[PDB]
């Protein structure tokens, strides 16, 4: 692999559901890259179907010379209108992927717990989720990191 | 890969069920291809069985020189007589595939939501689907893109 992800620091966590995602990403480039790296933040709106995935942001990083690199990757909150009611409250997943020449080489996944903070709403959740009262808590202590063999050319 | 699909723009979306599909496809050719590229639009009439697929259109593009290319891929609506009643209303998928030398290298998939727009129809859906009243809404914000390794 020409690119190695050293760490992902989860920032502004926990946060209100409507607040942006912020990740500080540190990566090492073993040798100069002529093309760009494409990073994405993907929110899994529903464990039941990939139909509910939302690409929250996508960014091109490059040209990338050899050495250690850092950047803050920000993304707006998911659109609640595309989240099924049954999945809104409870645990879901947020993904950070990076591709080089259309090929995914790394996937970082975090479990995300969306819950009410009010004892009232927690015990008796409304049928129609109240997103303005939901707190997103990314489980930053447990990053799930997957690497994939790709053609670095 | 000698061919890379850069983007697919979904056009005339949403539309009545009987209206044609329209996709603007942009792709890049890394080097000159001696063979043709074969594009298809495939409508999955039923999640339960591949028996209900409708290849809506198929097109040969080529010879393909190196560089950037764009084209509008149109296809007629699926035949409602081949769609099972249980699958007509609700979610299904539409695919866009491209082959080189008869080998599939790209598959672009979109979830498609077919629903009534009329309040009375939405609340009380007829047993026999009324296709003339269904609206097709392709979920263009979520393209699912699959690349396959082929022999170029």
């Amino acid at each position: 692999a020409k690119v190695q992800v050293n760490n992902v620091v989860v920032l502004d966590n926990p946060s209100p559901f409507y607040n942006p995602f912020q990740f500080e990403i540190t990566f090492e480039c073993i040798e100069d890259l002529s093309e760009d790296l494409e990073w994405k933040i993907i929110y899994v709106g529903s464990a039941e179907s990939e139909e509910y995935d939302q690409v929250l942001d996508s960014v091109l990083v490059g040209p990338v010379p050899a050495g250690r690199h850092m950047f803050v990757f920000q993304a707006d909150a998911p659109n609640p209108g595309l989240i099924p009611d049954a999945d809104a409250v409870g645990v879901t997943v947020v993904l950070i992927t990076c591709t080089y020449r259309g090929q995914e080489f790394i996937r970082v996944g975090y479990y995300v717990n969306n819950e009410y903070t009010e004892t009232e709403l927690r015990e008796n959740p409304p049928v129609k989720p109240d997103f303005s009262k939901l707190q997103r808590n990314i489980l930053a202590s447990n990053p799930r990191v997957t690497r994939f063999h790709i053609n670095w050319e | 890969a000698k061919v890379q699909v850069n983007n697919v723009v979904v056009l005339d979306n949403p539309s009545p069920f009987y209206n044609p599909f329209q996709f603007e496809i942009t792709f890049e050719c890394i080097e000159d291809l001696s063979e043709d590229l074969e594009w298809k639009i495939i409508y999955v009439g039923s999640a339960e069985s591949e028996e209900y697929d409708q290849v809506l259109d198929s097109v040969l593009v080529g010879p393909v020189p190196a560089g950037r290319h764009m084209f509008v891929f149109q296809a007629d609506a699926p035949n409602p007589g081949l769609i099972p009643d249980a699958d007509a209303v609700g979610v299904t998928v539409v695919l866009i595939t491209c082959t080189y030398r008869g080998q599939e290298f790209i598959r672009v998939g979109y979830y498609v939501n077919n629903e009534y727009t009329e309040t009375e129809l939405r609340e009380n859906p007829p047993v026999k689907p009324d296709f003339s009243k269904l609206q097709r809404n392709i979920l263009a914000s979520n393209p699912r893109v699959t690349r396959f390794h082929i022999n170029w």
Partner: peptide, 26 residues
């Protein structure tokens, strides 16, 4: 049979087999 089985069936049709499926081109 179930609502989940329908979703999984549609996802299999989208992905085909032997490939790598990603969200977007991007």
């Amino acid at each position: 049979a179930s609502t989940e089985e329908k979703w999984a069936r549609l996802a299999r049709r989208i992905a085909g087999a032997g490939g790598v499926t990603l969200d977007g081109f991007g």
